[PDB]
Structure formats: C-alpha cells, structure tokens
C-alpha cells in the first residue's frame, strides 16, 4: 500500500530554453523519497496538486473527475479518454456512486467549458496543479517491466494542458474499465536545483531539503564536493501549532449609529466620536449600505479582518460633490485650507457616499455652511468655530460697512442640480496599529495558548513564529509590547489573562558537515556544536561527545596520526578502513635526550641535501569597462549612467 | 579562508621543531634555575608559572565554545550578548590547537634549548653541558670564554635575579599584555556592532518584518522587504571587508613572530636590536592568549 | 549580473520593451547602482589580494638577494641546515629556489 | 471583490468599463442581474462560485421558510430615473502575459 | 522670580517596554 | 524649585482640536508655581532592568554631552576626541 | 557629492523648496544612503593605504 | 544565458533558430606622449590580426 | 546630432573651449578623465564599438 517516490515526477518550470546551466528554483514539487499510496475507487483528497502514476497492461485507467462536493450542486470537470479522442468537459453533473465503463453521469445543464481533441508494461505519469483559476496538466511516459511496485528511476514530465476552469478542486476520483495499479502522491512547496544538458534537457536534480549534503550542494551550486569540512546553515525546526489571542469582545460595533443618523453637521463644525469595545465586522454592511468612495491610508484593505485597532476615532461631516476629492492628505482648496485638514502620517480610512434623497429638499436646503475667509491655514485635525466679521487689513469692523464681510457661506442643495452640486456624507476613521493596547478588533476566533513549543502566533494582529515562555518582566498598565536593542519584539502581554510572555526564535546552533570527495562516497559526518550527547536531525550511528561538539557518523579510534580534516579543539577526521574515523591528532615524535655535565656529542660524518621552495611573485592584470558591464549596447542606459562618471574612473585608476 | 589562515598562522609559529623533548627531572643546570619556565609534575596544570600569570592577565569573553539552547532560554532577564549573537546567526569556531598543546610545544622547546642548545634546529640534537653552551654564546659576541669560567657564580645569580624580577613585574596589575586585549575587544565589538546595526529600516515603513507582514498584503510588502534585504546584505559585506583587513594585519604580525622564533630561539642572532637591547645570548618562548611572549 | 536589485526584471530589454522611457528610467537606475556596487566589491577584493601578493614578492626578492647572491648566516632562512648555495628557477607567476 | 470576482496582484492586462443605461436599464425595473452577498469565505483569484444553496450562519443545512436561513443571491434593481451610482455598467477585463 | 530647571521634567516617549538599554530620541523636551 | 530627577507618566490624551496659545491657573481664595517652555531637542535616556527611566543626557548642553551622545555611552575613557564642527 | 542617486534632484534645497515634508523624506533618504556609501568607500581605501 | 541575457530566438515566419550576439568586443589602449608635446597618439588593439 | 560635449568655463563664466567626446580616442580619453591635459603613458580606453 505504502511505497516511496524515489526521484519521481520532475517537470519543466517555465517555457524558456536553457542549456549547460544549473538552475535553482522554488515551486510545488514532489519531494524525493516521499510516501505514495498505491491502489490495486474512493474519493481521494486533492491537496494543492498531485502526482499520479498508472502501471497498466490493458488500458484500464481512462480519466479523472475533479470537484469539491461531487454532487449535482457544484461544478466538476471530467478529463477522459473514450478510446477515440480525449475530451475535457467542465460542467454541473449528478455524480454516480460507481462510475465505470458507459455512463459516468446522469444529467448536465450548467456547462461552462468544453474541449474535444482529434480522433485517434507501460508507466504513465501525470502532474496536476491548480493555480489562479488554471488547471495545469503535465504528462510523461516510460516503458517498464515491474509487476507490483512503482519502479525507481528519473523521468522528466512535459506540459500538455493549461485549462481555464475556475473550479474549487478539493477531491478527485479515477475512472476505470469494467492487472492495473495506480499511485498517488502529494506536492509541497520546495526548492529544487535542476541540471540541463547541452540539448536543453533536464537529466538530474537535487532536492535541497532532503539532507545536509543536499543543503551543501544547493549552497555552493555544484554537483561535486571536495574533501573537507563545511559550515552549513544553522539548526532549524518547523512550526507545529497555531496560537491566536484576541480580547474577548461581544458587542457588534455601531455601524448603524454612525452611518445611519438623522443629522450630520456642517464641514466647518465637524464632529468627532470615540469608538471602543467593539467587534468590527464590515460584512453586515453588504446588504444595505454602499459607499461611492472608500480609500484607506497606512494599511491594505485585505488585511482589515486580521488586525486589532488601538485608538479609533470617527469624524463626520457633509460636503458637496466637488469637495470629496479634497478630503485626502496633501491637498489644497477651501475645505482643506479653512475647514478640515488631514496630516501626512495619517492612518485610517475615508468613506463617502451620496445622500441626495435625504439631505436635499426642493426649493433649496440652506442649513449647511462652510468657511471661505480666514487669516491663515488650519493645522491638521484643528477646528475653527467662531463667526466674527472679516476684514482684509485685520482690524475689527461692523458688517454694514465697506471691506467687511461675513466669513461663512451657505451650501445651496437642490434636487434638480447635477451631481457635482449634490450633497455627500463623509466619515473619516483614524486609528493606530500594533504599538498600544487595543480594544477594537476583527471577527477572528481565538485559540488556546501553547507553551514551550515552536508555534505560529498572532497577538492582537502581530503575527510571527517562535517559542513562548513565561516571563518575569513587569509591564506598566499602558504598555503592551517590549523590544530588544535590535527592535525585535521579545515580550507580549496576553490579552485574556494579563500575564507577560517571552518570545524566542526557533533556530539556534551551528552545524558542520565533514565529507570526503563526492566520488568516494555519499556518506557524511555531522558535527553539532551547542548540543550535549536532542537537537539533531537524525540518530544515525556512533553518537559520542567530543571537545568540539557532538559528532554523528564517525568512529572513534584510540591511535593517533597526522590528520587531513581538521575538525577543531584537537580533534581530526580521516577516511580509513571503508568508513570515516575521528581521533586526536599527534603533535610529533617522542624523543628523550639525557643531560650530563661531562659528556658531549659530536657529529662524525655528513650529507648534502637540496630543498625546494615555491613562492608567488605576481598575479593576473585585469581591466573592466563600466559602460559594457552596466549598459550593454543601450543608449538610454548610457545616458542615465553619464552622471556616475567619477565613480567609474576611481575603479579604473585602482586597477591600473 | 580567514579561519584557515588563522590555523595556518598558529601552526607556522609554534610547530617549528619536529621531535617532542621530555622535561628533565633536574631543573638546576650549573647554577642556573630553570624551574619557573618549565612545567612541574605536582601542580594540576600542564604549564609553567609565568604562563599561568600570562593566562591570568588576559580576560576572555566566551571561555568555551558551547552555549546550549536551554541555557539561553534560562537567562532572559539577564540580556546576555552571546545569546543575542547566536540568535542572530553569528557564531565563533574553536581553534584547532588546544592551549595544552601549545604549552607542550613551548615546554619541549625550552627543554631542547636547555639541554641541546642550538644544534636541534640544524638537525639531530647534540647534548652539551650548559656552561659550555654559555661559553659559546659568550664567544659569539666577541668576549673570551674565560670571562664566563671565572665569573660563573655572579652570572648565575644575575640570571636568577632577572627571572625573579620578571616574575615580580608580572604579578602586579599593568598593561604589559595590552596588545592581546585589543584583538578580543575588536572581535566582540564588531559582532555587537552588527547586532546593533540590525535596527535600521533603510528607507522602509518599519525595521520589523512582522509589522510589514502584519499590515500589508504580500504585494506592496515584497518591495519593502527587498530594501531591508539589500541593507542587511550591505552590512554583512562591510563586516567581511573589515575582517579581511584585520586578518592581513594579524598575518603580518604572525610572520614576524615566526621568523623571530626561528632566528632567536633556535640560534643566536647577530642583527642589532632584533632580540632585546644588548648583545643577544638566549631566548625563551611562552604561550599567551592568542599570542606569544619572548624572554 | 542576473540580480534585478528590486526592479521589475533583470533584463534591460524587457524594461525598454514594455514601459515607456518614463517609468523605466527609475527602474534602470536601480540596476545601475547595483552593478556599480558589484564592480566596487570586485575592486576591493582585488586590492587586498594585490597587497598579499606584494608582500610575498618582497620576501622573494630579499631571499633571492641574500641567498643566491651570497651566503646567509640566518638560521632556517634558506633551507634546513647550514646554507651553502641556492639556485633560482622560473615558474608560472612565481619562483622556485633550490 | 470578496464574493463575486477577485483579481490577483501579479495581474497583467487592462480593465475597461462603460455606462449602459440606454441598453441594460428599462422602466418599472430590470431585475435580471444578481450578485452574491452571503458566503462562508472569500474567493481565490479568478475563481467562480455558481451554486444557489440556502445559507445558515452556523453552517448546517436548513429549509428557507425557517429562522436564520436565507437565500444567498440579491437582485440588482436597475431603473431609468435613478442616479448614476445606481445605473448599470458593463465591464470587460483583458488578461495576458508578455 | 527666575530659577533653573536642573534635570527636571522627563517623560516616557512611547508605550513600548524597554529594559537595560540606552534609547536615543528626538522630541519636545524641557 | 528643588533640584533632582523625576520621570513623568502619561495620564491624558484629550481629543480637543482647540487653538491653544494662552493659559491661566486657577487658585483658591504658601503655595507657588513654576512655568517653563519645551523645545525640540535630542535626549538619550537610560532604562533600568525594571524598565524605568533613571538617567538622561541632553545632547545640546555642552560638548561633553555631544561626545556622550555620539558614542552612546555614559562613560568616557581618557583621551582626546574629535567632536562635531562648530555650528 | 553631486550625484542624485535616483532622486528628483541632488540639491536638498530644491526638495525642501518644492515638495512638502511628506514625499520629500523618501527622496532625502536616498541621498542619505548614497552619501553614507561614499564615506564608507573613502574609509576602506584609506585603511588599505 | 546564465546572466539572463536573451541569446536565442525563433523567427515567427520561418521556424528557424537564430543566435543574437553583442556588437562591441575587444580592448583598446591609447599610447600618448604629453599633451604639450603633440596631439598625435598611437592605438593598440588587442583581439585583431 | 545628439552628442556628448565637455565645456570649459572661465573665471568670468564664459565658455571658451570644448571637447567633442566622439571625435577620436584621444577625446574619449579626455572626457573619461575630465581634463584637458594628459600625462605620458598608455591608457585603457573603452572597448571597440
Ligand atoms: C490664470 C493664471 C493662473 C496662474 C497660476 C500660476 C501658477 C499656478 C499656481 C496656482 C494655480 C492653482 C489654481 C488652483 C485653484 C484652486 C483649486 C481649488 O479650488 O481647489
Ligand atoms: C510514511 O510512511 C511510513 C511507513 O508507514 C511512516 O512511518 C511515516 O510516518 C510516513 N510519513 C509521512 C510523512 O506520512
Ligand atoms: C440533485 O440530486 C438529487 C438527488 O441526488 C435530486 O433529488 C435532485 O432533483 C437533483 N437536482 C437537480 C437540479 O438535478
Ligand atoms: C468519444 O466522444 C466523442 C465526443 O463527441 C464522440 O464524437 C465519439 O464518437 C466518442 N467515441 C466513442 C467510441 O464513443
Ligand atoms: C444553473 O442551473 C440552474 C438550474 O438548472 C439555473 O436556474 C441557473 O440559471 C443556472 N446558472 C446559470 C449561471 O445559468
Ligand atoms: C471552496 O474554496 C474555498 C477557498 O479555500 C474553501 O475554503 C472551501 O472549503 C471550498 N469549498 C468546499 C465545498 O470545500
Ligand atoms: C543531443 O541530441 C542528439 C540527437 O541526435 C544526440 O545524438 C546527442 O547524444 C544528444 N546529447 C546528449 C548529451 O545526449
Ligand atoms: C437606515 O435609514 C433608512 C432611512 O432612509 C431607513 O429606511 C432604514 O430602516 C435605516 N436602517 C435601519 C437598520 O433602521
Ligand atoms: C437583507 O436585506 C433584505 C431586505 O430587507 C432582508 O429581507 C434580508 O433578511 C436581509 N438579510 C439579512 C441576512 O439580514
Ligand atoms: C475575558 O477577559 C477578561 C479580562 O481580564 C478575563 O478576566 C476573562 O477570563 C476572559 N474570559 C475568559 C472566558 O477567559
Ligand atoms: C555536558 O557536557 C559537558 C562537557 O562540556 C559534560 O561534562 C557533561 O557531563 C554533559 N552533561 C551531561 C548531563 O552529561
Ligand atoms: C661516511 O663518511 C665516509 C668517509 O669518511 C664515506 O665513505 C661514507 O659514505 C659516509 N657515510 C655515508 C652513509 O655516506
Ligand atoms: C629555584 O627556583 C625555585 C622556584 O622559585 C625555588 O624554590 C628554588 O629555591 C630556587 N633555587 C635556588 C637555588 O634559589
Ligand atoms: C489659531 O491658530 C493659528 C495656527 O497657527 C494661528 O495662526 C492663530 O493665531 C490662532 N488664533 C489666535 C487667535 O491666536
Ligand atoms: C525592581 O523592582 C523590585 C521590586 O521588588 C526592586 O526590589 C528592585 O530593586 C528593582 N530594581 C532596581 C534596579 O531598583
Ligand atoms: C506565413 O506564416 C507561415 C507560418 O509557418 C509561413 O509558413 C509562411 O511562409 C508565411 N508567409 C510568408 C509570405 O512568408
Ligand atoms: C594571426 O596572428 C597569428 C599570431 O598570433 C599569426 O601567426 C597568423 O599568421 C595571423 N593570421 C594571418 C591570416 O596572418
Ligand atoms: C573678465 O572680464 C574682465 C572685464 O574687464 C577682463 O578684464 C578680464 O580679462 C576677463 N577675464 C578673462 C580671463 O579674460
């Protein structure tokens, strides 16, 4: 039932020709030596792409059905061969519990996509992937002879189909004829390194997450490793669980009291209201209320349901249609200068909607006013309420005189005017994010706390990965987070029980790989510093403690020699009868000469010796050309480079 | 490459002799007291008394190469610098030669000098009593050897007094070993500078990756993450360049120490002021943290 | 030379093929600064290697002066033993003393 | 953008929209255009949802003449005399690669 | 009438916990 | 006004939107009160192990404080240091 | 000191004279990184010499 | 290429493969006396016979 | 034609000399070093285009 996919199922990642290169890429791949399930017809789940293999002798497997609910209620797609052509059909059909060969269905009616091809011991391999409303199909073929298991080997798949279906695919099922076997494996997001021939064909690959030797190969971008010891990446663990901690809030947040009020003030007398202790599910507004403009600054809209907001204020007023564009940072005009001004470092959202059927009457509504005369511009979020007669010189005056005016004008709102002279209601929401205690959050559900384990966490909208431990710090009541000297968030207060928690990273500790040449063997030894022999990748053979660290994969010998691989702290390694051995290095040969106060030693004969000594004298003289390296045969790039000429003459002077 | 060069430097300085001479049982050679510069077999340590003082003069930072994960998670209230360095991807590798091996090398060299003299560098060691070797050293600077043979008591007493004065000078707190402390200070300060350099935002919304991933989508955030990537790569490159220049300086110093050890411990030199002030007679090497002390 | 340094692409032809001159001159300037930075890093490494080679060549010159043109008294400066003679031979980028 | 039609970030193409009040709007009220306003999750980019199943907030099946059971599709009401914000617009999105 | 403010009137610049650090900031201070 | 050092804590953040240029105190029908003015200035603050501010350096007071703010330390070793140019 | 490093101008006065504080602090940061890079290159050459 | 330079294309009218190469190639050195002496120079081209 | 020039200014702010950078390799060398005077020697100029 359970088999392994030994280097099985590699496909071309794009449509670009490459030859005699090594290309490193990251995509959805079947990992090397992973579990595959054999079938010798249930509903198999579809988890972001599958690898499918069919071992056949009489053409039993005929196609597939992809869908989610697999009933008459949702769309499903059938990709089948009916012995003369291959037909693909994405429609809405009533599935059967036992599909076989010649009816796979009862009835169809909401058919969307149709494609018919031209009319017409074995191993057939397929890769299926769903991405951005496209179903990608890759196909490959291999003649084999095995009878039970999936054979080992390497075979590259080619793209055959890119179907624009737009279908929720979570489940699938194969279709058989009324011997054969088929195998299913699952794809994962993984980094591979692929090798190209001189004919532009992929013939080898390296899975960079299989073992530390493959990590070393992907780091240096080569298939051959020389003899020695190499410092690889530090020891990492993957997160296991999820923790979501939000304040416990019950009330729906007052959308109706703000957006549906009988009376809004004028723009010169705009009103401010505090919002606190609420759950802000803006999806209840999708039934009744619609906004003509809604634009937010400081936060993307698609994340508004995953956050929690600290100091929420709502400003309300009414303007005309041509003034809605002025409610924005860095704007000028009568509203932005004399009535209502926004900062640059604004954080919030602006909503405005048309209200001609509520705030406009026949004959003319004159209850809304705006200021058009002032002796200076307003500061951000500053209000001016006074109604004093205005004089250009700056001295007090009586309004029935010359050069003395009233500083407020009336809005004249009629029913029959154009939309630029129609009333609009404007609400501005302003808040701050992720630096203070917060009480207005989204509709996300909370989760139990997990301690002393690498988890993904979400505290009041701040997401991350790490280990949570109890803390001894003493937060003041106005503080929620704590930071390092490197501005890393290392402490948090849990919003449900007011305890302090420390957050630590999950990766720690240096790892070295001791290897002979890749020609000699594929066996390696691994040295872990910072562990006492735990935090090791696997317990292979011969684990023992050295002075440098914990060594795995080598044998300890009592005899001492010269060494060729220096591990460190007096320990060395070699490749001896074969296996890898580790020992203490020898400082030299033991010798004894005895001191006497009356005897001397005199040489009696001699030899002539010749010794060689090699020394470097010079190296290669080199020159660079800035214009060709940076802008190869491009005139526009040369024009843009023209003002960096001082930098390039310095390099040429250094090289000369 | 830098780490391999540091191992080659230690090997080229200390491993000049080919055979490891044993420490003689008698430490008293014709009036001359060699007990303070040779190991004794009663104390637990493997090194001399002067090497003990030299190792006591220099303070260290890590004091081993093993910081376990549970140990770093046990000290959070105490903001240890080494845990922050190890949590940010910076590690320090152990040297190939242990301090005991270097002490054994210096003990073998001092024993070979005190027993064989100068002949164990040209080839096989030739035994000779210490007074005749002293006579040759006196004859090498233009003074006849009867001057040695008639004033042997005075010369031996002055030698012992000078060794005692060096010992008394080294028991008092001073800055004699001040150029070994600068190395460890520079290395620690460079790593701590990288750690403190990790809080610049380099012209982005924030310096915290969690805030960018917490607030934006993937979309506008991948162009704010790329600024941080280029800045931190630039910081690592600056650190590597400074380390290469410091390694060049250390290599020049180690080459000078190696040729001085070759020409002054394994023989007598005629070069003026190359080894001490005066006419050179002998030299003795002693091990020190990251360095060597010549007497 | 295949890093895009935070631009749309690493190919100048794609930027000139798709954008106008206008938005493209600010994507070209990122590539210009990146490639200039790469050349500067190469020049710095070359200067350090040249310093090492110059120190080696100075040592070879003084050894050739003091051991081929004369007899040296310095211990272990030319071979193991008492120095008698030395002969130089040329080698690719270097010298071999016998 | 949540329940009907969602675009990616790495979109390549053009979007065109134009007003069609003289063609797609009739007097008395044209009710032939619908949109979904209730769903158990957001759509993925370029993904379509066609089913018409009664919706319950808890997540269990229900009969529409009951309590807390709704029909998930709403009608657009297109009149001639309404303002331009309640008038029909035809939208065509072109997507390609280069 | 005239006196001096000898190291008088320092306040917390934000709402973030920090311990055993030196923090350099620029704001409205006495 | 006595000399010393004392750290203040936030108590109020009022959303008023008011032009404030003048003020006056209110008394009861002995006491004294003192008024000083704030300036835009760079400070360097020291935190304890309890997260409390207990010392500060005003970077524009004298050249020694400029040196302290440049090296980010409260202790200066013996020697001569090139500070910023005369402004 | 006359390179603009991919900004509107190489003169700080023009940026402060034409933009507000707002769009200008992101044009000033480009000049800051460029001039810091220039000083670092000078220091490296001085160390080798 | 390995440096992401487009070096091959298929002609869309006749399905043949074509290689694209740059136009500039070869180092050039200028030998000159002082500008006070003369304006004549000599030119050395590597990579040409 | 679209061309790169190098112009010299007096102490009175008057243009009195210029160098056409595409005339001959000597002018390319002059525009590369930004000077009107070249010392004796051999200089590696731009590659052949
Ligand atoms: C007719 C000659 C104009 C000359 C103007 C010269 C330079 C341009 C400077 C200012 C003109 C801006 C006019 C915008 C009027 C305010 C728009 C609004 O209501 O928000
Ligand atoms: C793969 O199968 C083996 C054998 O049943 C099992 O021990 C192992 O846990 C499986 N691994 C995964 C990831 O399912
Ligand atoms: C869907 O299937 C059910 C039973 O499977 C049936 O009762 C119902 O009529 C079908 N509806 C349609 C529209 O086919
Ligand atoms: C297979 O399906 C196609 C689709 O129309 C049909 O034309 C053809 O006759 C079918 N073949 C058989 C053998 O039924
Ligand atoms: C799907 O099918 C139902 C019933 O057959 C029908 O009422 C509905 O209009 C169809 N959907 C579309 C988009 O035509
Ligand atoms: C449809 O796709 C969404 C998107 O992930 C998913 O949450 C949902 O479960 C899918 N529908 C079914 C019936 O599984
Ligand atoms: C490339 O294809 C040709 C086709 O004739 C074949 O002869 C050659 O062996 C192939 N190259 C390699 C490396 O296999
Ligand atoms: C909102 O106001 C309108 C007035 O046009 C009213 O008809 C509607 O019932 C109000 N909404 C609620 C939930 O009361
Ligand atoms: C949406 O509004 C309509 C119109 O009154 C109403 O019948 C329906 O119940 C509302 N839906 C919900 C979920 O409240
Ligand atoms: C709700 O929050 C309060 C705030 O302290 C907390 O005491 C209480 O335990 C929370 N409720 C639950 C069920 O945890
Ligand atoms: C941990 O390692 C040390 C050597 O550094 C050893 O002495 C000690 O026994 C080890 N711990 C345990 C529990 O064995
Ligand atoms: C020792 O010297 C004699 C002559 O004195 C010579 O014949 C002999 O070869 C020498 N020994 C060796 C091993 O060469
Ligand atoms: C030689 O030195 C040792 C150690 O200091 C000392 O104990 C001994 O007395 C000395 N010998 C003489 C003769 O002073
Ligand atoms: C109101 O504030 C503005 C903004 O600085 C200021 O110019 C004006 O003088 C203030 N009003 C009074 C009466 O001082
Ligand atoms: C921190 O607070 C505790 C409270 O008991 C106190 O004992 C301790 O002295 C404080 N730390 C310092 C450095 O004053
Ligand atoms: C038009 O394109 C086809 C495609 O192969 C080609 O065969 C034909 O020669 C082209 N026509 C001309 C006039 O070149
Ligand atoms: C090209 O140059 C070589 C010298 O490198 C010379 O031997 C050869 O004759 C030249 N070619 C011709 C065609 O003269
Ligand atoms: C600049 O102008 C003055 C005008 O009197 C003239 O005398 C002087 O010669 C001019 N400078 C040069 C360099 O020609």
Residue numbers in the entry:
A (entry chain C): 31 to 70, 78 to 138, 150 to 168, 180 to 237, 249 to 603, 619 to 662, 672 to 750
B (entry chain A): 751 to 1045
C (entry chain C): 948 to 1045
D (entry chain B): 406 to 503
E (entry chain A): 31 to 60
F (entry chain A): 209 to 237, 249 to 306
G (entry chain B): 948 to 996
H (entry chain B): 554 to 602
Per the authors:
Among structural proteins of Sarbecoviruses, spike (S) protein is responsible for receptor binding and mediates membrane fusion between cell and virus to initiate infection. RBDs in SARS-CoV-1 spikes were observed to be in the “up” and “down” positions making the spikes exhibit open and closed conformations, respectively. We introduced these three disulfide bonds in equivalent positions in the SARS-CoV-1 S sequence generating three spike variants: S/x1 (S370C and D967C), S/x2 (G400C and V969C), and S/x3 (D414C and V969C). We determined cryo-EM structures of SARS-CoV-1 S/x1, S/x2, and S/x3 spikes and we identified various previously undetected conformations for SARS-CoV-1 S through classification procedures.
S/x3 was found to exclusively adopt an RBD “down”-locked-1 conformation by cryo-EM. The S/x3 spike was only observed to adopt a symmetrical locked-1 conformation, its protomers share very similar features as S/x1 locked-1 protomers, with bound lipid and residues 602–619 forming a flexible loop. In this study, association of lipid binding and locked conformations were observed for SARS-CoV-1 S/x1 and S/x3 spikes. In locked-1 protomers, interdigitation interactions between Y622, F305, R620, and Y819 are formed through π–π and cation–π interactions. We have proposed that these interactions rigidify this area preventing structural transitions needed for RBD opening. We further demonstrated an engineered RBD “down” S/x3 spike as an immunogen. After priming by 10 μg of S/x3 spike, mouse sera showed induction of neutralization titers against SARS-CoV-1 pseudovirus. A boost by another dose of 10 μg of S/x3 spike increased neutralization titer further by ∼100-fold. The complete immunization regimen induced a serum neutralization titer of ∼5 log10 dilution units.
